[PDB]
Amino acid sequence: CSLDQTVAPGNLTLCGNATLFTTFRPKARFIAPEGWMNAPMGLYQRADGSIHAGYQSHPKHIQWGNISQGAAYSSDFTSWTDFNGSEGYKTIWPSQIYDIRGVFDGSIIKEGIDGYPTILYTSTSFGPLGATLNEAEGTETQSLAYTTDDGASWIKLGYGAGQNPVIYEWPETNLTGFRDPYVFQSPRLEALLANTTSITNATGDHFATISGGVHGDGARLFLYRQHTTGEFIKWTYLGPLVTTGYKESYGEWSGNYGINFETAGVTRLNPAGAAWDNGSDTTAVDFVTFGTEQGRADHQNHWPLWAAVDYEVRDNGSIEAVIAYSGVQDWGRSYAYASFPVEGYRQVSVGWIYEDDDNVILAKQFGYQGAFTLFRDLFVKVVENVSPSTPGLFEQASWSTKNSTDGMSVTVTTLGQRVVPETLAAYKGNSTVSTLAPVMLNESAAAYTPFSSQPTDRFYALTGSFEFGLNTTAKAGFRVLASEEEYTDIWFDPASENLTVVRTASSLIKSFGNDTELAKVKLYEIVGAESKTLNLTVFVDGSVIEIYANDEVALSTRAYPWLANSTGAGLLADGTTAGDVVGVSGLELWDGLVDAWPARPANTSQGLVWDGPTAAMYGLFAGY
Amino acid sequence: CSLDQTVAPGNLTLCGNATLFTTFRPKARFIAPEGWMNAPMGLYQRADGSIHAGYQSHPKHIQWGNISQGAAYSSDFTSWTDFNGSEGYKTIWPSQIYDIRGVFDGSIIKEGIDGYPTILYTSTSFGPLGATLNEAEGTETQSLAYTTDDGASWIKLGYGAGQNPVIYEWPETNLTGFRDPYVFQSPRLEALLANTTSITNATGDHFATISGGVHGDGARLFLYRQHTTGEFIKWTYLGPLVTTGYKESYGEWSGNYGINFETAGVTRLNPAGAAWDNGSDTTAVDFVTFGTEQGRADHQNHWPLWAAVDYEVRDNGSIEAVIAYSGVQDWGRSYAYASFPVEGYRQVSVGWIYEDDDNVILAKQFGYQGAFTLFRDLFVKVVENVSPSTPGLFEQASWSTKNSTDGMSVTVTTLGQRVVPETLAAYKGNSTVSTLAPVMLNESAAAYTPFSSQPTDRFYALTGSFEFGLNTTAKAGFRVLASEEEYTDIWFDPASENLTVVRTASSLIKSFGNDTELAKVKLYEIVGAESKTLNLTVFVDGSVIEIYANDEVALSTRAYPWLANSTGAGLLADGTTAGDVVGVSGLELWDGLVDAWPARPANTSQGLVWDGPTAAMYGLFAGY
Ligand SMILES: *[C@@H]1O[C@H](CO)[C@@H](O[C@@H]2O[C@H](CO)[C@@H](O[C@@H]3O[C@H](CO[C@H]4O[C@H](CO[C@H]5O[C@H](CO)[C@@H](O)[C@H](O)[C@@H]5O[C@H]5O[C@H](CO)[C@@H](O)[C@H](O)[C@@H]5O)[C@@H](O)[C@H](O[C@H]5O[C@H](CO)[C@@H](O)[C@H](O)[C@@H]5O)[C@@H]4O)[C@@H](O)[C@H](O[C@H]4O[C@H](CO)[C@@H](O)[C@H](O)[C@@H]4O[C@H]4O[C@H](CO)[C@@H](O)[C@H](O)[C@@H]4O[C@H]4O[C@H](CO)[C@@H](O)[C@H](O)[C@@H]4O)[C@@H]3O)[C@H](O)[C@H]2NC(C)=O)[C@H](O)[C@H]1NC(C)=O
Ligand SMILES: *[C@@H]1O[C@H](CO)[C@@H](O[C@@H]2O[C@H](CO)[C@@H](O[C@@H]3O[C@H](CO[C@H]4O[C@H](CO[C@H]5O[C@H](CO)[C@@H](O)[C@H](O)[C@@H]5O[C@H]5O[C@H](CO)[C@@H](O)[C@H](O)[C@@H]5O)[C@@H](O)[C@H](O[C@H]5O[C@H](CO)[C@@H](O)[C@H](O)[C@@H]5O)[C@@H]4O)[C@@H](O)[C@H](O[C@H]4O[C@H](CO)[C@@H](O)[C@H](O)[C@@H]4O[C@H]4O[C@H](CO)[C@@H](O)[C@H](O)[C@@H]4O[C@H]4O[C@H](CO)[C@@H](O)[C@H](O)[C@@H]4O)[C@@H]3O)[C@H](O)[C@H]2NC(C)=O)[C@H](O)[C@H]1NC(C)=O
Ligand SMILES: *[C@@H]1O[C@H](CO)[C@@H](O[C@@H]2O[C@H](CO)[C@@H](O[C@@H]3O[C@H](CO[C@H]4O[C@H](CO)[C@@H](O)[C@H](O[C@H]5O[C@H](CO)[C@@H](O)[C@H](O)[C@@H]5O)[C@@H]4O)[C@@H](O)[C@H](O[C@H]4O[C@H](CO)[C@@H](O)[C@H](O)[C@@H]4O[C@@H]4O[C@H](CO)[C@@H](O)[C@H](O)[C@@H]4O)[C@@H]3O)[C@H](O)[C@H]2NC(C)=O)[C@H](O)[C@H]1NC(C)=O
Ligand SMILES: *[C@@H]1O[C@H](CO)[C@@H](O[C@@H]2O[C@H](CO)[C@@H](O[C@@H]3O[C@H](CO[C@H]4O[C@H](CO)[C@@H](O)[C@H](O[C@H]5O[C@H](CO)[C@@H](O)[C@H](O)[C@@H]5O)[C@@H]4O)[C@@H](O)[C@H](O[C@H]4O[C@H](CO)[C@@H](O)[C@H](O)[C@@H]4O[C@@H]4O[C@H](CO)[C@@H](O)[C@H](O)[C@@H]4O)[C@@H]3O)[C@H](O)[C@H]2NC(C)=O)[C@H](O)[C@H]1NC(C)=O
Ligand SMILES: OC[C@H]1O[C@@](CO)(OC[C@@]2(OC[C@@]3(O[C@H]4O[C@H](CO)[C@@H](O)[C@H](O)[C@H]4O)O[C@H](CO)[C@@H](O)[C@@H]3O)O[C@H](CO)[C@@H](O)[C@@H]2O)[C@@H](O)[C@@H]1O
Ligand SMILES: OC[C@H]1O[C@@](CO)(OC[C@@]2(OC[C@@]3(O[C@H]4O[C@H](CO)[C@@H](O)[C@H](O)[C@H]4O)O[C@H](CO)[C@@H](O)[C@@H]3O)O[C@H](CO)[C@@H](O)[C@@H]2O)[C@@H](O)[C@@H]1O
Ligand SMILES: *[C@@H]1O[C@H](CO)[C@@H](O)[C@H](O)[C@H]1NC(C)=O
Ligand SMILES: *[C@@H]1O[C@H](CO)[C@@H](O)[C@H](O)[C@H]1NC(C)=O
Ligand SMILES: *[C@@H]1O[C@H](CO)[C@@H](O)[C@H](O)[C@H]1NC(C)=O
Ligand SMILES: *[C@@H]1O[C@H](CO)[C@@H](O)[C@H](O)[C@H]1NC(C)=O
Ligand SMILES: *[C@@H]1O[C@H](CO)[C@@H](O)[C@H](O)[C@H]1NC(C)=O
Ligand SMILES: *[C@@H]1O[C@H](CO)[C@@H](O)[C@H](O)[C@H]1NC(C)=O
Ligand SMILES: *[C@@H]1O[C@H](CO)[C@@H](O)[C@H](O)[C@H]1NC(C)=O
Ligand SMILES: *[C@@H]1O[C@H](CO)[C@@H](O)[C@H](O)[C@H]1NC(C)=O
Ligand SMILES: *[C@@H]1O[C@H](CO)[C@@H](O)[C@H](O)[C@H]1NC(C)=O
Ligand SMILES: *[C@@H]1O[C@H](CO)[C@@H](O)[C@H](O)[C@H]1NC(C)=O
């Protein structure tokens, strides 16, 4: 096997384990030291202000199995340090009959057992497990563990009656799934339920949702309430919080609700960030975020969605979250978004970006799979003075509209997402920053125009504001990871409202995915404006391309160019003329970003192992 | 609930957990501190000469489950000390996907991994498990662990390819079972296989049997050989060592071979004890000991058997053990005999005595279930100058006969069993010993004649030699645990050759078993003798009654009299007359025996617990 990146790639399947470890690997984001990772889990801000991040982990393997919590910490979301204990960077692992099949996703009770941070997680045991299988009660249960050393280790409650698992009875029959407990406090829900606590006897200050669905009848998010404040064993099922139909879609801007929910969370936001009011803040909005499965033909059958909801109290002392509008958290190769509270009235969200090697052709050669997204502040995005002639504005798809008294302008409300400012500041400050001159794209514009300053490697950020005419048919955007022979094109086409990532030339290596990514972006036209603007920011980090538009739309994807010089970037233009012009301004290149794992050497592989012939006998894990 | 043992028992099912802990509990033998125990395991003589004894254990429960190795040690087989570590008296427990369903029986490689004592044990995982179920490959595998601290703790090899489990492929299809690996060295088998090692490539100095069978086609003992000396991962299947038919019986003296073997072992003995010759000792005999299941209507469907075998070498480099004669290791409520080598050319055997509460009526009230038998030296019993007119002598059922040159006398050979002398010496020396006058049982004999000295509690031993006429129809024996209203009768009836334990009056508590126990005993008549003699020794230890006849026949059973004064003992006589007389001599009572667990308080209960509703969901363990 040749690793010569100045010539065409050979047959890379002949290369040894982890021989391509550094070739495509992100350096500026959260990623496991090696091996398989998936969903973020156990996220919390520790007492010292640092962030604890857990993740679903299978060290020394490149497929899922024996799933455990790997963990690390950071003071700024950006520069991280691994925990190191008796199980390396793992801090929770399968060890008991109730969780031996996997320590699945879980979330944090900050003041839990004996006052310590406490995780409620899905403990899995034997049997068919999956939304398309005939799962039985007991295969997925919910269990507790607590930490006396700020996440270096966790102590599980004992197995048995009145101990672990703490939630095991299915709340309804024929579930498609029963996992991913999300624990949260909610002055809002407490106020809504306060007149019904005699019906249920549940008066605790923590709520928990469990994600699932019902066979043949769509997804469900089940709401539990802690029975008594300061006691963590008894959780009382109230009722279904979110109920959607079998492969129901709210429309083109909203993905598809599939057959089963995963990793669902509940939050309340206002324009500044997290809102902890009881309903009295008229600017605050209740949101649910959730993954759905089997409602999508590609992207591992997974949609990471969100919905704004209006809560209604049922007669039996439960809550119906009625969906008001519904959107997409990320349109690309990401899933399993977890959100958590951060000091200063913030709610921060992070997800998992999977690879684009679904046939597992070069996974062993990588020696790892997966990374996180960047950490994102959630908030209510409010756009004032929106023109009523904005096309499709009153579909109110993934946004709400409020007319002015005179009917001449509209206020638009939707979910806002932006990269946490700590990361943007660290990235910019550690990079070589080039502030680029504005560019008018007209009849003289080439299809591709390289920036006047170029990246030096596969670790950079780009930003720009693209000003379009209101009736434009021109397209513009950014080309990244570019040489003559390999490149990835990020286009926005205002006439169709489509942001695309064209990957037909992303790599000479043909086994990686090359399908076109697509997001919908609504340019809310402002009253009196004779143009409409797209603010586009792109992070390039090894193989990750993570795109943000207007602090609203996110699209994560993957590109794996072979050639060492496929690092360039610049502007894309199509159909720009003397009359149909695209003005690009606020252009900036940040070359280098940050080394996110300063204590790690370049190659943190420990090799790969095979579980042997028993893996197929047990039938639980691939074994590699 | 009343614990008044001076009046009739009330409804004892109303009593709390462990309220009857001391009432019926053995004090002079190996028993767990509390809870459930079954099979002995991991038996070995440590480097300091002490004995390490493991056992199948489920603390704080009174039914089987989460099965683990509990352990203790002794310098003399008699006075024991518990290990105490992070898991109390447990030293191996379910902890990995491959053994999470139970750490089943295993045996010791004394010089194993890195020179340390090493256990090869059955590691169980999920799925139907049992001889009457449809078990699949992987549910029972065989795994290694080693100890660096003389049995205080064990370190398992890692899970995976080339590590644990080390034996997982079924050697034949449709097995009824695949467990209880018995590792042993054998100069005999090495010599027999030495000319065939090119066929198999297996040249190690350790052999291992695995116990099982084939659906519809009887039991099997599978023989493996360590592939290479000093290496413990690779074990090569040679072939079936013992093959018996579906519920085949060798006859009235031999139990029934059932459908599946459990806890099988292989040894070689001579008249003095263990034999380590290569075949050159003409006095040595090869033996297999084994449990069988589903060949018996009662006694938990279990026979603990043994067979003398003659080894034949197969063309494919394996061994057929052809059964020469076949007997019973214990005729009562015991099973799961394990044997192990002890210094001074000894092979020592010990089994598990279960309770007689098969409907689980008072198990919670006990707070424990099970004990060991006494430890027994195995040897070849040889009886010289046997008269050819001994009835049924040439059936050669569970013995062999060799005629003298002149045909006027016979040498009889069979398996000998006797209590280890360390235990007999300690028992006698710590007891109040009464040497009783000989008694002729004739026309004046009462049905029951109390001994001139009486026991003071339920912990004593009796011995006597009963001399019968060659054509007697009289019966005699011992009554034990006796008051006016409760008693247990041990009879021998030479005319039928039956040793019985009649338990119709054993207890006023009606929920315990009351069926009559039965053993066959052959009194080998000596040339020139005008009488035949039964040497009968009985140990009474709480509820255990353990009977030995002629250092050959063993019968363990249970009696649970309620009354505090049901402790007496004496002679039984039936049909003795002026002409048909039974002479009893060598009579001795040992009152008190030994406190086998001197560091333990009287009540070592830690209470009982319930696993909760998930026990029924997982379906593996009762949960209590
Ligand atoms: C099948 O069998 C399995 C094996 O038996 C079984 O698993 C075992 O289950 C039991 C029962 O649930 C578990 O026991 C619990 O353990 C908890 C602690 O767990 C952590 O620590 C242990 C032991 O720690 C040591 O040993 C290891 C090994 O050598 C070392 O690594 C450590 O350094 C440490 O060593 C020191 O201590 C040793 C002696 O113990 C010394 O020898 C040594 O020199 C050192 O000094 C670890 O083994 C655990 O690891 C395992 O589990 C983790 C996950 O948790 C895994 O990641 C890991 O891989 C291992 O599998 C773990 O790290 C105990 O806290 C717990 O005791 C509490 O609960 C019980 C009730 O259940 C009470 O009786 C008890 O009193 C305790 O409750 C009190 O305290 C807590 C807080 O401390 C309070 O919340 C509570 O309210 C209560 O308060 C009381 O006291 C207060 C203070 O005084 C007072 O204020 C209050 O008022 C009140 O009175 C319990 O002992 C055991 O860990 C499992 N073991 C394993 C290996 O899994 C399995 O379940 C069975 N399966 C089935 C299906 O049945
Ligand atoms: C799902 O995930 C699970 C979790 O990841 C996974 O289970 C884990 O599997 C791994 C991999 O198999 C296991 O790792 C092995 O561990 C062996 C030791 O195991 C014992 O000790 C550990 C750790 O001990 C400490 O930590 C605990 C907890 O705090 C304390 O209680 C102890 O006191 C002790 O603490 C000290 O050390 C800590 C740091 O480690 C310090 O922080 C602390 O301050 C103290 O100083 C225990 O956790 C184990 O307990 C568990 O298992 C037991 C049963 O074994 C249970 O009863 C218990 O409940 C727990 O479950 C246990 O007690 C290692 O020996 C082993 O490493 C050897 O093998 C690997 C290859 O596999 C080699 O890479 C490595 O080099 C070692 O091999 C060398 O050494 C041996 C002899 O020592 C030689 O035989 C060998 O040939 C080789 O020799 C080499 O070195 C020689 C010397 O230099 C040289 O001469 C030679 O030439 C040669 O070079 C390995 O690390 C891990 O234990 C499992 N953990 C658990 C919790 O189960 C599970 O499998 C996964 N499942 C699936 C389906 O995938
Ligand atoms: C003495 O020791 C015991 C341990 O053995 C210990 O714990 C008790 O253990 C017994 C079992 O021995 C448990 O009994 C079972 O209880 C089930 C119902 O339990 C519910 O109601 C109870 C009564 O109010 C509550 O106490 C329970 O609370 C505990 O558990 C919950 C979790 O559910 C936990 O949140 C709490 O904190 C408590 O820990 C609980 O709410 C019964 O379903 C079960 O019934 C079986 O057994 C009966 C008697 O044999 C039958 O009548 C039933 O039909 C059924 O048995 C059948 O058996 C067949 C054959 O196997 C099978 O095929 C059928 O399907 C069926 O199962 C049983 O009665 C008891 O709950 C438990 N108590 C606890 C934990 O508090 C004691 O605490 C200990 N005492 C002391 C003082 O220490
Ligand atoms: C690089 O990293 C790997 C870990 O990923 C590590 O270990 C190797 O891992 C691979 C899997 O990635 C193993 O491959 C499998 O091997 C099976 C046969 O193995 C036997 O032959 C080998 C070749 O001589 C031996 O090396 C093996 O020895 C080891 O294992 C034994 C225990 O059996 C142990 O005693 C020894 O000590 C060694 O540890 C062993 O004797 C194959 O059956 C298996 O085949 C599957 O995959 C193929 C390729 O995809 C297909 O062609 C097959 O059809 C089959 O896949 C199918 O998949 C579908 C879909 O899932 C399924 O439905 C079908 O049923 C079917 O399964 C596979 O090839 C490899 O054995 C293992 N090597 C080891 C442990 O040494 C490497 O060591 C590491 N390299 C380095 C240098 O570190
Ligand atoms: O680690 C468990 C936690 O992860 C979640 C959230 O993702 O559950 C994920 C889940 O499967 C993930 C898995 O499967 C996906 O990809 C497959 C191949 O394209 C596709 O067929 C599946 O429909 C899709 O779910 O991802 C990897 C491959 O990327 C694959 O090996 C995994 O199965 O994990 C559970 C058990 O595998 C599944 O039920 C579940 O969908 C969260 O819900 C869990 O807590
Ligand atoms: O601990 C596992 C090791 O023990 C052995 C040797 O005994 O396997 C025993 C075994 O079952 C023991 C068990 O069942 C017996 O009693 C039942 C009730 O009378 C009867 O129906 C069964 O046929 C008989 O096997 O004993 C207790 C009750 O005394 C009961 O709970 C147990 O099942 O353990 C395995 C799993 O339970 C069985 O497959 C096996 O027969 C040894 O072979 C194991 O290493
Ligand atoms: C990039 O590398 C390729 C292969 O070495 C080469 O053909 C090309 O000219 C290089 N330079 C570029 C794209 O500027
Ligand atoms: C409360 O009512 C809802 C709507 O009928 C139902 O789905 C839920 O199961 C009920 N909650 C209970 C029974 O706890
Ligand atoms: C909102 O404004 C638009 C444009 O003026 C108008 O068509 C629509 O009827 C208004 N809606 C309401 C509720 O007044
Ligand atoms: C570089 O990044 C580090 C780690 O995130 C950060 O702490 C530091 O402030 C950055 N340097 C700058 C902004 O000069
Ligand atoms: C824009 O995207 C939609 C999917 O939402 C698709 O149907 C349509 O064809 C696209 N149009 C163009 C011009 O890209
Ligand atoms: C034994 O105890 C019972 C009940 O207290 C009593 O009736 C009997 O007389 C006692 N004495 C004996 C058997 O010698
Ligand atoms: C050796 O021969 C015997 C008798 O045919 C057979 O049962 C056994 O499986 C053979 N051993 C092998 C194939 O290893
Ligand atoms: C053994 O001795 C008996 C009695 O003398 C005789 O009947 C029998 O035939 C003898 N057997 C042999 C093999 O000589
Ligand atoms: C009493 O028993 C102990 C423990 O088995 C033993 O060591 C001691 O020798 C015995 N006492 C005698 C024989 O006097
Ligand atoms: C002796 O035991 C056998 C069972 O081996 C039985 O068939 C026979 O009836 C018994 N006879 C007497 C008199 O007890």
From TrEMBL, chains A, B:
<feature type="glycosylation site" description="N-linked (GlcNAc...) asparagine">
    <location>
        <position position="195"/>
    </location>
</feature>
<dbReference type="InterPro" id="IPR013189">
    <property type="entry name" value="Glyco_hydro_32_C"/>
</dbReference>
<feature type="glycosylation site" description="N-linked (GlcNAc...) asparagine">
    <location>
        <position position="442"/>
    </location>
</feature>
<feature type="domain" description="Glycosyl hydrolase family 32 C-terminal">
    <location>
        <begin position="453"/>
        <end position="590"/>
    </location>
</feature>
<feature type="disulfide bond">
    <location>
        <begin position="1"/>
        <end position="15"/>
    </location>
</feature>
<feature type="glycosylation site" description="N-linked (GlcNAc...) asparagine">
    <location>
        <position position="430"/>
    </location>
</feature>
<dbReference type="InterPro" id="IPR013320">
    <property type="entry name" value="ConA-like_dom_sf"/>
</dbReference>
<dbReference type="Pfam" id="PF00251">
    <property type="entry name" value="Glyco_hydro_32N"/>
</dbReference>
<feature type="glycosylation site" description="N-linked (GlcNAc...) asparagine">
    <location>
        <position position="403"/>
    </location>
</feature>
<keyword id="KW-0326">Glycosidase</keyword>
<feature type="glycosylation site" description="N-linked (GlcNAc...) asparagine">
    <location>
        <position position="84"/>
    </location>
</feature>
<feature type="glycosylation site" description="N-linked (GlcNAc...) asparagine">
    <location>
        <position position="174"/>
    </location>
</feature>
<feature type="binding site">
    <location>
        <position position="179"/>
    </location>
    <ligand>
        <name>beta-D-fructose</name>
    </ligand>
</feature>
<comment type="similarity">
    <text>Belongs to the glycosyl hydrolase 32 family.</text>
</comment>
<feature type="binding site">
    <location>
        <position position="64"/>
    </location>
    <ligand>
        <name>beta-D-fructose</name>
    </ligand>
</feature>
<keyword id="KW-0378">Hydrolase</keyword>
<dbReference type="GO" id="GO:0005987">
    <property type="term" value="P:sucrose catabolic process"/>
</dbReference>
<feature type="glycosylation site" description="N-linked (GlcNAc...) asparagine">
    <location>
        <position position="514"/>
    </location>
</feature>
<feature type="binding site">
    <location>
        <position position="38"/>
    </location>
    <ligand>
        <name>beta-D-fructose</name>
    </ligand>
</feature>
<dbReference type="InterPro" id="IPR013148">
    <property type="entry name" value="Glyco_hydro_32_N"/>
</dbReference>
<feature type="glycosylation site" description="N-linked (GlcNAc...) asparagine">
    <location>
        <position position="471"/>
    </location>
</feature>
<feature type="binding site">
    <location>
        <position position="105"/>
    </location>
    <ligand>
        <name>beta-D-fructose</name>
    </ligand>
</feature>
<dbReference type="InterPro" id="IPR023296">
    <property type="entry name" value="Glyco_hydro_beta-prop_sf"/>
</dbReference>
<feature type="glycosylation site" description="N-linked (GlcNAc...) asparagine">
    <location>
        <position position="535"/>
    </location>
</feature>
<feature type="binding site">
    <location>
        <position position="262"/>
    </location>
    <ligand>
        <name>beta-D-fructose</name>
    </ligand>
</feature>
<dbReference type="GO" id="GO:0005737">
    <property type="term" value="C:cytoplasm"/>
</dbReference>
<dbReference type="InterPro" id="IPR001362">
    <property type="entry name" value="Glyco_hydro_32"/>
</dbReference>
<feature type="glycosylation site" description="N-linked (GlcNAc...) asparagine">
    <location>
        <position position="565"/>
    </location>
</feature>
<dbReference type="Pfam" id="PF08244">
    <property type="entry name" value="Glyco_hydro_32C"/>
</dbReference>
<feature type="binding site">
    <location>
        <position position="180"/>
    </location>
    <ligand>
        <name>beta-D-fructose</name>
    </ligand>
</feature>
<feature type="glycosylation site" description="N-linked (GlcNAc...) asparagine">
    <location>
        <position position="278"/>
    </location>
</feature>
<keyword id="KW-0732">Signal</keyword>
<feature type="domain" description="Glycosyl hydrolase family 32 N-terminal">
    <location>
        <begin position="32"/>
        <end position="381"/>
    </location>
</feature>
<feature type="glycosylation site" description="N-linked (GlcNAc...) asparagine">
    <location>
        <position position="603"/>
    </location>
</feature>
<dbReference type="GO" id="GO:0004575">
    <property type="term" value="F:sucrose alpha-glucosidase activity"/>
</dbReference>
<feature type="glycosylation site" description="N-linked (GlcNAc...) asparagine">
    <location>
        <position position="11"/>
    </location>
</feature>
<protein>
    <submittedName>
        <fullName>Beta-fructofuranosidase</fullName>
    </submittedName>
</protein>
<feature type="glycosylation site" description="N-linked (GlcNAc...) asparagine">
    <location>
        <position position="201"/>
    </location>
</feature>
<feature type="glycosylation site" description="N-linked (GlcNAc...) asparagine">
    <location>
        <position position="316"/>
    </location>
</feature>
<feature type="glycosylation site" description="N-linked (GlcNAc...) asparagine">
    <location>
        <position position="498"/>
    </location>
</feature>
